[PDB]
């Protein structure tokens, strides 16, 4: 019973959900299929909850169901035999990653134009090159780190120097409470496939200079019971 | 530009009276204030907060009898952003703030009126 790793227990309020949540999502999607006319698939791989809430508040009449890929695959039907309605696994197979499956009764073209005109700012999200280039100045670094006049900003907090020095691999010293470096550290170049620590550096300095525009792949109509594929971003 | 100098119960002197004259007669309460800052000009005005609006509608203590319509006017005051579909839900959202303050809505605890709302004994004009 021994020579194991002890699980670090902590005492919080929230608790795991289990199979009841998944069955609830299953029943919800299956009862909304009968209700609404059109159903769409939206690939939302890395999002902010306020952006998702904006997308949801854009229509209180239409539904948006997130959840687990394999659960929505089962609700729709992955096999041509196992399916709720006809030609539905043809849609269910399109789901790739984080899929937000939307239901509506609204016209095709309103949705199509909305989800290509909708664009927001977001972080650069590693494994994705960034359209920016940053040499930090070679003096004292500020909370924005080379984005505005330093006379606006204040120096960052001394508590971040272990983080910058170890996790971000920046060469860092501090003279009094201020953080300092000797030479201008370049972090990234445009058209350079980003890595985790570059992304974290840009996040720490507060750089949302990437275009979040949701991708839509397919679309299915209940009365026609047909699929239709439109890669629109 | 914009800043927030809530701090109530460049040119940092004239902003004092500019803020106080946003709270001339009301409020005498710790409200939240937004300062739109031009070159050296402080266009300062209150941004509505639920707690402060409730305490206007009413160591210190609280017992309100807010009468169920002042809370609806507050819900109309800040259904602007609100991240919520209906006034019938924003009213619950505000009744929770009232519960935390410790007030007494009409003459009951506001959680019981949330019960009456979601049970179908209280109506909301949408």
């Amino acid at each position: 019973p021994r020579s194991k790793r002890s699980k670090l227990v902590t005492l919080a309020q929230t608790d795991k959900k289990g199979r009841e949540n998944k069955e609830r999502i299953f029943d919800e999607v299956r009862e909304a299929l009968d209700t609404y006319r059109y159903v769409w698939v939206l690939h939302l791989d890395d999002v902010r909850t306020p952006v998702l809430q904006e997308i949801r508040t854009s229509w209180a009449g239409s539904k948006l169901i997130m959840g687990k890929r394999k659960v929505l695959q089962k609700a729709l039907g992955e096999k041509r035999e196992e399916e709720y309605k006809e030609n539905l696994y043809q849609l269910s197979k399109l789901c790739s990653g984080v899929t937000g499956l939307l239901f509506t009764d609204e016209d095709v073209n309103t949705v199509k134009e909305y989800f290509k005109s909708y664009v927001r700012s977001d972080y650069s999200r590693p494994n994705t090159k960034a359209p920016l280039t940053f040499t930090i100045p070679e003096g004292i670094v500020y909370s924005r780190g080379g984005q505005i006049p330093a006379e606006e900003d204040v120096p960052m907090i001394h508590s971040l120097e272990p983080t910058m020095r170890n996790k971000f691999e920046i060469p860092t010293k501090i003279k009094a409470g201020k953080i300092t470096i000797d030479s201008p550290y370049l972090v990234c170049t445009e058209g350079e496939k980003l890595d985790v620590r570059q992304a974290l550096i840009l996040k720490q300095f507060g750089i949302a200079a990437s275009e979040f525009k949701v991708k839509v792949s397919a679309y299915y109509d209940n009365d026609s019971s047909t699929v239709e594929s439109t890669n629109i971003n | 530009k914009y800043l927030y100098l809530r701090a109530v119960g460049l040119s940092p002197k004239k902003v004092g009276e500019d803020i106080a004259k946003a709270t001339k007669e009301f409020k005498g309460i710790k409200v939240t204030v937004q300062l739109k800052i031009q070159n050296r000009q402080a266009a300062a005005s209150v941004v509505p907060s639920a707690s402060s609006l409730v305490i206007t509608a009413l160591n210190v203590k609280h017992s309100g009898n807010i009468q169920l319509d002042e809370i609806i006017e507050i819900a109309r005051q800040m259904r602007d952003k609100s991240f919520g579909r209906t006034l019938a839900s924003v009213t619950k959202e505000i009744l929770g703030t009232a519960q935390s303050v410790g007030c007494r809505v009409d003459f009951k605890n506001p959680h019981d009126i949330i019960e009456g709302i979601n049970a179908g004994e209280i109506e909301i004009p949408e």
């Binding site: 227990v9 001394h158 272990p162 170890n166 501090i174 009094a176 409470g177 | -």
Partner: protein, 95 residues
């Protein structure tokens, strides 16, 4: 001296370069060293170690219990032979 001078010093210069890694590694090796002290520390020190460990176990058990739980007679007759509380005591010899 004169005030919290080391807190000021930590704010101005900061603790070391090799401080956080070493602390993490101490916290990691503590699991090994606790058992090392159990199979070692002959005598009174091992006894006291076991006592401490048992008390610590009981404390954490009670803490978790408190967490998970925080998640006929009347009042006046409640709380209610002429033999003394000690008959037949040990007999003492005159010697």
């Amino acid at each position: 001296p004169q005030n919290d001078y080391i807190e000021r010093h930590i704010k101005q210069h900061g603790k070391r370069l090799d401080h956080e890694e070493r602390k993490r590694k101490r916290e990691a090796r503590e699991s090994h060293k606790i058992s090392e002290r159990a199979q070692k520390l002959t005598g009174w020190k091992g006894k006291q170690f076991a006592k401490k460990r048992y008390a610590e176990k009981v404390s954490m058990r009670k803490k978790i219990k408190a967490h998970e739980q925080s998640k006929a007679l009347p009042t006046y007759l409640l709380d209610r032979k002429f033999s003394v509380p000690l008959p037949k005591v040990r007999g003492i010899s005159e010697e």
